Short mmCIF file of C-alpha atoms and ligand atoms in Angstrom, two decimals:
data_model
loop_
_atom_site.label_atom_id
_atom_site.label_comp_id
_atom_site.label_asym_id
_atom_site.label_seq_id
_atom_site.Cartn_x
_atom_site.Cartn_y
_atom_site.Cartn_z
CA UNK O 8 -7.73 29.77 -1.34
CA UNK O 9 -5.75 27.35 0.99
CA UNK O 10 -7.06 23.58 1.66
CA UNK O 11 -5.48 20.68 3.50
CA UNK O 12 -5.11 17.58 2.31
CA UNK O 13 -4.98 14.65 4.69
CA UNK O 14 -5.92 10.54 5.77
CA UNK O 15 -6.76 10.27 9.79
CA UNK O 16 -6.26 7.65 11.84
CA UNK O 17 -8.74 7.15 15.12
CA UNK O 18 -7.82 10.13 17.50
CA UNK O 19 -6.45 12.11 14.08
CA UNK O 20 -3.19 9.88 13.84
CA UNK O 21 -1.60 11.16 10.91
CA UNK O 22 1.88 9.59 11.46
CA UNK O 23 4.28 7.11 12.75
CA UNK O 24 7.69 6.54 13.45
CA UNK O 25 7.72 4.18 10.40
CA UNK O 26 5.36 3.84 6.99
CA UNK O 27 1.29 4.17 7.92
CA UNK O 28 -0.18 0.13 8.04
CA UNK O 29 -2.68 0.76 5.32
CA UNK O 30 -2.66 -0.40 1.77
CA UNK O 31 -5.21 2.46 0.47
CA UNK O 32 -4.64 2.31 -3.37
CA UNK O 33 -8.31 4.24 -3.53
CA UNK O 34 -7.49 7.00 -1.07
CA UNK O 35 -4.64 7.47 -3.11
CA UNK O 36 -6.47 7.97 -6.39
CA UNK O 37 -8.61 10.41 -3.89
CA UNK O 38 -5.85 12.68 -3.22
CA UNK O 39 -4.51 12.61 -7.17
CA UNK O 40 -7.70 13.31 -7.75
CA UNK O 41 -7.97 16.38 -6.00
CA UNK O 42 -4.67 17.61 -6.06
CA UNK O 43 -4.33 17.54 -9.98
CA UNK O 44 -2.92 20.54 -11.73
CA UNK O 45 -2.49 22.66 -8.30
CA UNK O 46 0.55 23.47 -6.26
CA UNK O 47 1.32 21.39 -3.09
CA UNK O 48 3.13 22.67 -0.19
CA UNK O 49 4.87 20.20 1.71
CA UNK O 50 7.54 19.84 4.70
CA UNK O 51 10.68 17.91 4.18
CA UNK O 52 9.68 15.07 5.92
CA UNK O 53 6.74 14.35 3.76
CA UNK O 54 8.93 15.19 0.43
CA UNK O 55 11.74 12.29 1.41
CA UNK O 56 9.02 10.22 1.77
CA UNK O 57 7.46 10.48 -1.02
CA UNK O 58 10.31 9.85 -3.20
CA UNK O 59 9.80 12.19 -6.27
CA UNK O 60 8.07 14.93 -7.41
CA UNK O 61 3.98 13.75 -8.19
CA UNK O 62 4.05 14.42 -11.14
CA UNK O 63 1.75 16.75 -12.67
CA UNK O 64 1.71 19.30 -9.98
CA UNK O 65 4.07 21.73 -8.90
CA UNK O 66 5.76 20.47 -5.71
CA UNK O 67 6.48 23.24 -3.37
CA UNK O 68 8.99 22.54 -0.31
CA UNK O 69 8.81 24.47 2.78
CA UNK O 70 11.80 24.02 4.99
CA UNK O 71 14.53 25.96 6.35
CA UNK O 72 17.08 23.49 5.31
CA UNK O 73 19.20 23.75 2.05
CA UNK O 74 17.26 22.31 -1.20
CA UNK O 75 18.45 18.54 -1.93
CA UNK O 76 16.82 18.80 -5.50
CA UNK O 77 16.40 21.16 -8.62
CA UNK O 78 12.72 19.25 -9.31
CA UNK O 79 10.74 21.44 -6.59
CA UNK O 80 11.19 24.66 -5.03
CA UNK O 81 12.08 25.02 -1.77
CA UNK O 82 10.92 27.97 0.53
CA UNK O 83 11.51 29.60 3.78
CA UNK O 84 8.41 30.53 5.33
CA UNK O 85 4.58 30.29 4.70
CA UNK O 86 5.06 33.69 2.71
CA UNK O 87 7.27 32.64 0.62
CA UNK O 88 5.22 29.21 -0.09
CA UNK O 89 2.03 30.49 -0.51
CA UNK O 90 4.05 33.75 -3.24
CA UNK O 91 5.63 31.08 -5.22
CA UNK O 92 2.20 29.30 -5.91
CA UNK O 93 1.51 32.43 -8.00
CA UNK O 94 -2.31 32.82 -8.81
CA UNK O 95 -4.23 30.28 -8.53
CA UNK O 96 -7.41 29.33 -7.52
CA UNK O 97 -6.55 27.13 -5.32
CA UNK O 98 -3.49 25.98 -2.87
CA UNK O 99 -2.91 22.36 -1.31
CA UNK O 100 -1.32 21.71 1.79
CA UNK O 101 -0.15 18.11 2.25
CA UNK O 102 1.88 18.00 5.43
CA UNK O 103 2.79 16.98 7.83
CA UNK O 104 1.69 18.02 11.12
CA UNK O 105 3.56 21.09 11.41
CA UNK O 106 2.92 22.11 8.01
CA UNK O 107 -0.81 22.15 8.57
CA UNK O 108 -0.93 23.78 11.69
CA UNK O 109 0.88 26.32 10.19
CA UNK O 110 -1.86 26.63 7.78
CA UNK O 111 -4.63 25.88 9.48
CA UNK O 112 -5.87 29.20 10.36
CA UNK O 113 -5.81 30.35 6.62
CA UNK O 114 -7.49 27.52 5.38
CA UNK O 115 -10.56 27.26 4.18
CA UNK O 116 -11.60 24.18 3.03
CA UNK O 117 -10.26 20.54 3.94
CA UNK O 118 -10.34 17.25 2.14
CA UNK O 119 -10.22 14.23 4.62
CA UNK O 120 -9.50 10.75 4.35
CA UNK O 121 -11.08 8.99 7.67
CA UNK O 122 -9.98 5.53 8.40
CA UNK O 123 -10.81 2.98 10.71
CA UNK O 124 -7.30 1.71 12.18
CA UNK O 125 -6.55 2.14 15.47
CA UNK O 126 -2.66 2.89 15.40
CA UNK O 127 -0.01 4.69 18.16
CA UNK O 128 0.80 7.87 16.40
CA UNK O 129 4.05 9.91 16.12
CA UNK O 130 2.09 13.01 14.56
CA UNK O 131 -1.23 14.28 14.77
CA UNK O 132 -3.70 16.55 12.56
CA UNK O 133 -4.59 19.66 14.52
CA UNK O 134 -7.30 19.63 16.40
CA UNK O 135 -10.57 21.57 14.67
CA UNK O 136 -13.45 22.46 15.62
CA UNK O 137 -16.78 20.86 14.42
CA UNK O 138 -18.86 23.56 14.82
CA UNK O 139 -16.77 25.91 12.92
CA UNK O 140 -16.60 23.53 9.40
CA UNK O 141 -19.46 22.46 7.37
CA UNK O 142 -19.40 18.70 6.02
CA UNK O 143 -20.70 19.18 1.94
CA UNK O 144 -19.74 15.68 1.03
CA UNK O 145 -18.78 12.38 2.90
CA UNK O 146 -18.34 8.71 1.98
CA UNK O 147 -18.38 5.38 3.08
CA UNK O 148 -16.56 2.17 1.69
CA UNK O 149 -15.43 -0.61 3.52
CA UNK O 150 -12.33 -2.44 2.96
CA UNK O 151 -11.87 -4.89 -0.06
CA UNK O 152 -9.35 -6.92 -2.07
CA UNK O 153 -7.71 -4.19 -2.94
CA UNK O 154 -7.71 -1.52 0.86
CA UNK O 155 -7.20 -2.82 4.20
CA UNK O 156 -9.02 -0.99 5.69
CA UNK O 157 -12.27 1.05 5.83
CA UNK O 158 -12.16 4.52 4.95
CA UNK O 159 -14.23 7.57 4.57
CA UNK O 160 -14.33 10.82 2.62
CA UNK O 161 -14.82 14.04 3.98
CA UNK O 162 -14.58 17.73 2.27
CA UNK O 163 -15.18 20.41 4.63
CA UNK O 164 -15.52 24.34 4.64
CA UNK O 165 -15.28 26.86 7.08
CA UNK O 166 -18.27 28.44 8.62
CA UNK C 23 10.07 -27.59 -10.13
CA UNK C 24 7.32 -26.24 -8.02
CA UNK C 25 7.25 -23.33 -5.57
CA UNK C 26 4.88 -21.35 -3.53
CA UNK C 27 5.82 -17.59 -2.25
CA UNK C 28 3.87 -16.10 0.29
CA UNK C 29 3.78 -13.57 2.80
CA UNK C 30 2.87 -14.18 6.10
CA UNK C 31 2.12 -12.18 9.55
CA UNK C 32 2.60 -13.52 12.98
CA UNK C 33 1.14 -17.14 13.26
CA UNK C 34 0.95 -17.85 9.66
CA UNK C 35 -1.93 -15.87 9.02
CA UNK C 36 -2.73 -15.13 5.23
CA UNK C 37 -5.00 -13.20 2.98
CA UNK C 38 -8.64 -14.21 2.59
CA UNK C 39 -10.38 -11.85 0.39
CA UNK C 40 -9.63 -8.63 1.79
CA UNK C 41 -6.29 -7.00 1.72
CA UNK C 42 -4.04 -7.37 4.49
CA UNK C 43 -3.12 -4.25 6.86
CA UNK C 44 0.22 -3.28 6.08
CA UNK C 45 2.63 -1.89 3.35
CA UNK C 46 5.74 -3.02 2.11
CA UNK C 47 6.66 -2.30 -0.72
CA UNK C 48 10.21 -3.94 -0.35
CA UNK C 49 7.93 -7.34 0.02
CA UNK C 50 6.56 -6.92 -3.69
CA UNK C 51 9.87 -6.01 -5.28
CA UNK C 52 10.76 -9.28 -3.71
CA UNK C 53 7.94 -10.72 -5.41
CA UNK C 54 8.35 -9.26 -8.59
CA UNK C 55 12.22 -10.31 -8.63
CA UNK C 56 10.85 -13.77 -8.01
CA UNK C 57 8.15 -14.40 -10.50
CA UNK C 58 9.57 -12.97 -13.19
CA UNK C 59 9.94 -14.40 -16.39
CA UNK C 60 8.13 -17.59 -14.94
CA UNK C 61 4.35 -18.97 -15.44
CA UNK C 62 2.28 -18.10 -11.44
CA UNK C 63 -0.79 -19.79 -10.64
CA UNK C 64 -3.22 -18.65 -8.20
CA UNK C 65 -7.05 -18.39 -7.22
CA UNK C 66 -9.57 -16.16 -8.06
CA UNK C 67 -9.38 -14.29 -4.62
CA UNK C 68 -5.95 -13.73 -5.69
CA UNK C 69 -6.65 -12.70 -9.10
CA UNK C 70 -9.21 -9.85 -7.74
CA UNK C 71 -6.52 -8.67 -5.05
CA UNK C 72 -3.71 -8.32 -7.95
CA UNK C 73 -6.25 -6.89 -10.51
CA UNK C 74 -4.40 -7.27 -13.69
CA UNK C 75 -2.57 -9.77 -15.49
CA UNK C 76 0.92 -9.61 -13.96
CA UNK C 77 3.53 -8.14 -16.71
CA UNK C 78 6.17 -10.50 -18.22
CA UNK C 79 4.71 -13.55 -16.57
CA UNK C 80 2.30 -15.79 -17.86
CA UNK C 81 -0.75 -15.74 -15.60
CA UNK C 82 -2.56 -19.09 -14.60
CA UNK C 83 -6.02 -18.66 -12.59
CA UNK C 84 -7.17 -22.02 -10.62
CA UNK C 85 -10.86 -21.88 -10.29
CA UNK C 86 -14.37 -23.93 -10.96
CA UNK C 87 -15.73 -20.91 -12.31
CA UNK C 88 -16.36 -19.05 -15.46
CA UNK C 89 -13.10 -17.28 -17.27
CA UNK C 90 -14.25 -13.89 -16.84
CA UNK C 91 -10.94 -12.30 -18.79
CA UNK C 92 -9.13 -13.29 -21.63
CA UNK C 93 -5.85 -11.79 -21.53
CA UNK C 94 -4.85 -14.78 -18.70
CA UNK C 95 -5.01 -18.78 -19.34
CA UNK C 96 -8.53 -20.09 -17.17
CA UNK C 97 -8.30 -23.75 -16.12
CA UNK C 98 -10.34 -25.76 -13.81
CA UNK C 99 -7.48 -28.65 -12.47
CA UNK C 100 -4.11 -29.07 -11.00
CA UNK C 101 -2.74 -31.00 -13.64
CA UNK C 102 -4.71 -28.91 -16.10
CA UNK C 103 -2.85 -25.91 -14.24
CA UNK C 104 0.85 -27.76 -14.58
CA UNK C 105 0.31 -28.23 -18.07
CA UNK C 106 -0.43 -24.75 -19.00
CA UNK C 107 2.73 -23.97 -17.61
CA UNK C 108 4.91 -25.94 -20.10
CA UNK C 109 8.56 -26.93 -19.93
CA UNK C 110 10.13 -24.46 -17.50
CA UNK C 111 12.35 -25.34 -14.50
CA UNK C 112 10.38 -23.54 -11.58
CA UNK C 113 6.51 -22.94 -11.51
CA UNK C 114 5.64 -19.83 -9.35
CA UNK C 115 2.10 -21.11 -7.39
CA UNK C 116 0.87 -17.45 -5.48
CA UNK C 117 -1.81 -18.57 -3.83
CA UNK C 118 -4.44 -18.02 -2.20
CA UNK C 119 -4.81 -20.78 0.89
CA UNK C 120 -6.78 -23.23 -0.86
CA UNK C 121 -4.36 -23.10 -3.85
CA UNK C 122 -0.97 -23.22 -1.61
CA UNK C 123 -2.89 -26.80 0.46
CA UNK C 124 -3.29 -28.20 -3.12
CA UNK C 125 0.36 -27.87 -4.38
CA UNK C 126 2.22 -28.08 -1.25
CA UNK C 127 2.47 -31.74 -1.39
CA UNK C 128 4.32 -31.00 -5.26
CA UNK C 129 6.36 -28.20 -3.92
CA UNK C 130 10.11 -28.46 -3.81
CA UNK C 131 11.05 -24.86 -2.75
CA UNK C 132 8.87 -22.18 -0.77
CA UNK C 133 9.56 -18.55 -0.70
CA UNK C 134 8.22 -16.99 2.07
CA UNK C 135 7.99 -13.55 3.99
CA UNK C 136 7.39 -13.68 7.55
CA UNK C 137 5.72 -10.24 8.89
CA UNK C 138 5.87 -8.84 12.23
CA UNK C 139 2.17 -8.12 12.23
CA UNK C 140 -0.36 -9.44 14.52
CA UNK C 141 -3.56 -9.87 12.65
CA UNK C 142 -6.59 -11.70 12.91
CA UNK C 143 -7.19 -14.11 10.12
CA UNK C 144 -9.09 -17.43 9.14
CA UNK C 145 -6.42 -18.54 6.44
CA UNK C 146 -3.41 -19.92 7.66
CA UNK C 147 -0.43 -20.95 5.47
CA UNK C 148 -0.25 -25.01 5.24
CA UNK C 149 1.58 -26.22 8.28
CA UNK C 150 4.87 -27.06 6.77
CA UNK C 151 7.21 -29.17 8.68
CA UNK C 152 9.98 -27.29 9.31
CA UNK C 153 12.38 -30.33 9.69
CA UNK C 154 11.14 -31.95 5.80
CA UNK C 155 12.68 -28.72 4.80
CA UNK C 156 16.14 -27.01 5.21
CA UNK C 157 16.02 -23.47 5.11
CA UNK C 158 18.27 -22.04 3.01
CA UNK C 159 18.28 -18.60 3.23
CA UNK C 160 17.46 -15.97 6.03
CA UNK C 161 17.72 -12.25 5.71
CA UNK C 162 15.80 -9.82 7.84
CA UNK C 163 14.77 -5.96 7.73
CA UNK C 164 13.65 -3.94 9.96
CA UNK C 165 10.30 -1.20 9.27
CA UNK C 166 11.53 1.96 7.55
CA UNK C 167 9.66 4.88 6.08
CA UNK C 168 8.57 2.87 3.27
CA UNK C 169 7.52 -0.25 4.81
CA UNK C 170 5.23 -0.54 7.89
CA UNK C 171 6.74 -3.67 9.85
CA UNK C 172 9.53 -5.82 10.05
CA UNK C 173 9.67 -8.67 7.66
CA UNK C 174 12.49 -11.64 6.87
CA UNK C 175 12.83 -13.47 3.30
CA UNK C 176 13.58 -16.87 4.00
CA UNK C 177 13.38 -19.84 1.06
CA UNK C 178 13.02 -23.41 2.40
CA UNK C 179 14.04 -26.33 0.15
CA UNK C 180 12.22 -29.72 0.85
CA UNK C 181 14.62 -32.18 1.85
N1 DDF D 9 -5.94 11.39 1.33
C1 DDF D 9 -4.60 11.46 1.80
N2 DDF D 9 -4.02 10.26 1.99
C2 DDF D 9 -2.68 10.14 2.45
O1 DDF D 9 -2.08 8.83 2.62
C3 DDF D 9 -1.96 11.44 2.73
C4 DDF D 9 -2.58 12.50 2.56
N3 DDF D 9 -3.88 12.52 2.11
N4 DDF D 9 -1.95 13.76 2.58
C5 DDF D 9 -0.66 13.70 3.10
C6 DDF D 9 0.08 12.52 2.87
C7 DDF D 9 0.54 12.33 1.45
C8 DDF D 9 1.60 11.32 1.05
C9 DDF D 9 1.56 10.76 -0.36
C10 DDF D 9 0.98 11.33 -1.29
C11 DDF D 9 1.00 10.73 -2.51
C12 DDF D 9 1.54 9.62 -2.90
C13 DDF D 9 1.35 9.25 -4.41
O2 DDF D 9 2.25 8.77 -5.03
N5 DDF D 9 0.16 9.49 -5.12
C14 DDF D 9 0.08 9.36 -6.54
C15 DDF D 9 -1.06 8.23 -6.91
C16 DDF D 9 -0.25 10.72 -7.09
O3 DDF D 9 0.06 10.88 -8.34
O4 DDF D 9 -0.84 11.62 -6.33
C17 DDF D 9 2.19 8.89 -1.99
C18 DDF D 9 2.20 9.48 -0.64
C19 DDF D 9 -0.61 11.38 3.26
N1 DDF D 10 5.89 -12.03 -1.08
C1 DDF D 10 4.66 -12.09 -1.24
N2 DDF D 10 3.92 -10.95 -0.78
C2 DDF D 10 2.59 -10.94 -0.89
O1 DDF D 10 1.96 -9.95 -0.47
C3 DDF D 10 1.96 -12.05 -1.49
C4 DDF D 10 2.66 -13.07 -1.89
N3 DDF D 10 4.02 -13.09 -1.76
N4 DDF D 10 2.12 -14.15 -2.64
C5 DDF D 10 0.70 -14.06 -2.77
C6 DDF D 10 0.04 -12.75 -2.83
C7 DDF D 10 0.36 -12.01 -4.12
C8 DDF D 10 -0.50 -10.81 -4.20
C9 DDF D 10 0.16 -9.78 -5.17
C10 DDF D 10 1.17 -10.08 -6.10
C11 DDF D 10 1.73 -9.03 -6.93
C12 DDF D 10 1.34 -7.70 -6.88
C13 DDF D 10 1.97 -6.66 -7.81
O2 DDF D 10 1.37 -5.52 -8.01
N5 DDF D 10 3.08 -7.09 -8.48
C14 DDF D 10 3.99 -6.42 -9.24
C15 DDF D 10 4.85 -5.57 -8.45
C16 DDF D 10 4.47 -4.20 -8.76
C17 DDF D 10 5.12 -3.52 -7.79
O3 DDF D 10 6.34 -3.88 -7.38
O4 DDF D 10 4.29 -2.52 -7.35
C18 DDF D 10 4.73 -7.32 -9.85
O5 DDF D 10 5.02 -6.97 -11.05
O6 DDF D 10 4.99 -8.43 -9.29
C19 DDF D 10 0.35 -7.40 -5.97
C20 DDF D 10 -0.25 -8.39 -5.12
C21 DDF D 10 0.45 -11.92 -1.74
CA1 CA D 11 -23.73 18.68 4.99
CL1 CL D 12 6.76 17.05 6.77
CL1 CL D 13 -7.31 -17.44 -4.14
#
């Protein structure tokens, strides 16, 4: 199955022009955590940004630009990104905004990071509908000396 | 020789406990180039936020309580603090506000990174006369897709 991956911002700010002003070392053990040892699919914005492959996972990038690096795979279409994961149990999409509206519709589950800044955003997460996804886990932590911010963890399924 | 490095948003606003709202990662490469090699002293607020002994430096806590760990040196004074540090030409203090008020008056060079980020704080950097020091260097970047806001190095040397 297909899940998305993703930290919100009030009013589902995903993105800005410029890095996110959060220092969230927890929500990024979160997302390690549960993206371990499965593919990721990821647009070429989010891949420059991250700077290398994570390691540990195979890195899938869907663009319709030539491939800048023999690390990942690049792909064409959804297709051809969700065929190169192969078989596996399951398939994590990690942006950005285009790339998860694209998969959206097939996904099933979703993994969400909420956090309490209130930020102008570039990008947004789709919209989805409450009444269509079942919360099954959520949790609370304010900031300390180590986050900025307060965040909250979400996993969702679809109804 | 003593300095102080610290990193600033709008108004001289500094950490308390929690960390502050932003990311740049250019700022602790700064750092890191900076303290290298050379003996930092700092809090225990400061010693939670960093939550390790810092590699390759050797790592002084300032604090009336109990040395919880034993990998860093635990002392209770300023002057116990110099000592520790030994013969070296430049002492690296890193903080936190109580810390920076105590050496100031000892300091000889400050390394500081002002932040374009509005944030509200009850620490404040020492007010340092600008005109008992010349500042000596200046360089300033602008937010990227790595770090979150705008930020200038400067160093100040106390004339
Ligand atoms: N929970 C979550 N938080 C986030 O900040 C993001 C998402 N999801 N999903 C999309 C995107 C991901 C960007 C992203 C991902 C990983 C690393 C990283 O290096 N993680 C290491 C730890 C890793 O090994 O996963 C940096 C940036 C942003
Ligand atoms: N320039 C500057 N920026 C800051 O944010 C601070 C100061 N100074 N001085 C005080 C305090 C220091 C807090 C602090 C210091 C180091 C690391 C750290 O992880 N240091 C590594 C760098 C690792 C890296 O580049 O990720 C290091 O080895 O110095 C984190 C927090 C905060
Ligand atoms: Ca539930
Ligand atoms: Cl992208
Ligand atoms: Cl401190």
């Amino acid at each position: 199955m297909i899940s998305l991956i993703a930290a919100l911002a009030v009013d589902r700010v995903i993105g800005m022009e410029n890095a996110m002003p959060w220092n969230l070392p927890a929500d990024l053990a979160w997302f390690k955590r549960n993206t371990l040892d499965k593919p990721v699919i990821m647009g070429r914005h989010t891949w420059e940004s991250i700077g290398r492959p994570l390691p540990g996972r195979k890195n899938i990038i869907l663009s319709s630009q030539p491939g800048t690096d023999d690390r990942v795979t690049w792909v064409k279409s959804v297709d051809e990104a969700i065929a190169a994961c192969g078989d596996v149990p399951e398939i994590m999409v990690i942006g950005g905004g285009r790339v998860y509206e694209q998969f959206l519709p097939k996904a099933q589950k979703l993994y969400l990071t909420h956090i309490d800044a209130e930020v102008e955003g570039d990008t947004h997460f789709p919209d989805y509908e409450p009444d269509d996804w079942e919360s099954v886990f959520s949790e609370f932590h304010d900031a300390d000396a180590q986050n900025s911010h307060s965040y909250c963890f979400e996993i969702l399924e679809r109804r």
